[PDB]
Design a protein around this ligand. Sequence first.
Ligand SMILES: *[C@@H]1O[C@H](CO)[C@@H](O[C@@H]2O[C@H](CO)[C@@H](O[C@@H]3O[C@H](CO[C@H]4O[C@H](CO)[C@@H](O)[C@H](O)[C@@H]4O)[C@@H](O)[C@H](O)[C@@H]3O)[C@H](O)[C@H]2NC(C)=O)[C@H](O)[C@H]1NC(C)=O
Ligand SMILES: *[C@@H]1O[C@H](CO)[C@@H](O)[C@H](O)[C@H]1NC(C)=O
Ligand SMILES: *[C@H]1[C@H]([NH3+])[C@H](CO)[C@@H](O)[C@H](O)[C@H]1O
Ligand code: NA
Length: 497
Amino acid sequence: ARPCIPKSFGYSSVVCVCNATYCDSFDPPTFPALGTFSRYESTRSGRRMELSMGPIQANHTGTGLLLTLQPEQKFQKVKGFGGAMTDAAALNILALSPPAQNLLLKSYFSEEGIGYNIIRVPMASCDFSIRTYTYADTPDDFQLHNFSLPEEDTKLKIPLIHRALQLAQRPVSLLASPWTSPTWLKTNGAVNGKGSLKGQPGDIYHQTWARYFVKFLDAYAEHKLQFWAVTAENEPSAGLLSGYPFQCLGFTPEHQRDFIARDLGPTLANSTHHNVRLLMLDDQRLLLPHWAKVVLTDPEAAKYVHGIAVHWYLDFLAPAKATLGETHRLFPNTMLFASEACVGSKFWEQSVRLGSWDRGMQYSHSIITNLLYHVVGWTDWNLALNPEGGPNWVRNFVDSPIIVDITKDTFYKQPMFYHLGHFSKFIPEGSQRVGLVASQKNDLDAVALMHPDGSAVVVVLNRSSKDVPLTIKDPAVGFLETISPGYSIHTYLWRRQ
Ligand SMILES: *[C@@H]1O[C@H](CO)[C@@H](O[C@@H]2O[C@H](CO)[C@@H](O[C@@H]3O[C@H](CO[C@H]4O[C@H](CO)[C@@H](O)[C@H](O)[C@@H]4O)[C@@H](O)[C@H](O)[C@@H]3O)[C@H](O)[C@H]2NC(C)=O)[C@H](O)[C@H]1NC(C)=O
Ligand SMILES: *[C@@H]1O[C@H](CO)[C@@H](O)[C@H](O)[C@H]1NC(C)=O
Ligand SMILES: *[C@H]1[C@H]([NH3+])[C@H](CO)[C@@H](O)[C@H](O)[C@H]1O
Ligand code: NA
């Protein structure tokens, strides 16, 4: 293993500095012996997923905080964790020297790094692009004879996705989402602004747009890439808004319902891509449960919908119980999945705050809350950005867990990288959330899961300044005596047999 090289930029914590010859990494992962636990600790004071071990003891006395594992009490199974391969992320990554590129990709995708198993792939251009394009810009090509992948896919995204899959030990799931259709399919004839597909579901415009998904998956399959899932549209609500500044395509929930039922569902179902999952919504969770009721109460739409994708941007309006909780109660067999998050998109937020602990805590707080309300996965936005938070053709700059400094052939791993890795690295696909009961009221955020192999994982986040001693009881194994430092995040792992 190789430790964090810390650097301060005057914010609350440090970044870890990597370059062509050096990056912080782990040793090969294992469980310690039965009766021992592993702790990984990150702190605002500068610890970065530091590994320690302790004994699991037969007995416990005290009136301190006890968190009792409920291994019998089972909730959702995890799909996974990852980020987005936008044009901006791909340009930032490929601007590094080849050896620095490989250290960045290992940081995300390998067991020497944090074990990402999800990549979100935009279907052509979005705001995190430098060129505005679709795959079918030749007008009135309803046949899609002129559908093609440009160099943004064939030279940048696709080769990087192959290199990520080559570095991974866990199967990586690709997720595709479109921002805009070709402008000749749209009411407003522009990639942006208020506008929907022309006509109505079941017509030539909607059939063409559904066939465009199949053409996309056909083109990526020619490059030996297969998708786990697509979303029905990135942020369909955005295309309902006057002047929306970048690539969008407006659907009401009724329009999405009818488009899925008539066009996208049947077109995917009758293609070689029939196993590819379809996720609906791909938008702010305040739209639940209303969007889920509109789409999923129509059985002809419901039969094609695997899952509901959510974005975090208005989570402050949208209590998890009233949205995620209510949606799970009404549609328990339709998985909830978090498909886009980043800090820096509010007009008052600075784009990039190198070393921000607050932004790290925003990530881990969101992931825990999502996991506590049945969500099966969590997906970052841009995998890498430049120090301005770009490039972005409408200057909608944001933050990213990795910031590339091409003049120094350097990249910085921010607190958000480690906060996400406290989950991604230690919660493999198939992990099942289990109960975790507190003996008393407390300021911690915590979640417990069981690996498919039966081992235990617990993540504890302390967003307070105060150290909290605590005990974790696993009824079948014993007690972990520990302490959650102020402004810390821990992951605990142990064999149960
Ligand atoms: C890529 O990043 C690498 C990590 O920063 C760069 O390597 C570093 O280069 C600097 C400047 O030559 C070295 O700094 C000197 O450090 C020694 C202390 O050395 C040792 O102790 C440190 C821990 O404090 C440990 O990390 C090392 O392994 C050594 O045992 C001081 O005495 C000097 O005054 C001066 O500060 C770093 O030691 C060196 N680190 C490593 C791990 O090699 C590398 O140059 C960068 N590459 C490019 C192409 O830019
Ligand atoms: C579109 O595809 C057709 C059929 O292969 C081709 O002959 C035509 O020139 C293409 N059009 C453009 C404008 O690229
Ligand atoms: C999600 C989100 N609004 C971010 C940041 O604003 C944007 O860059 C993506 O296009 C969007 O889908
Ligand atoms: Na901003």
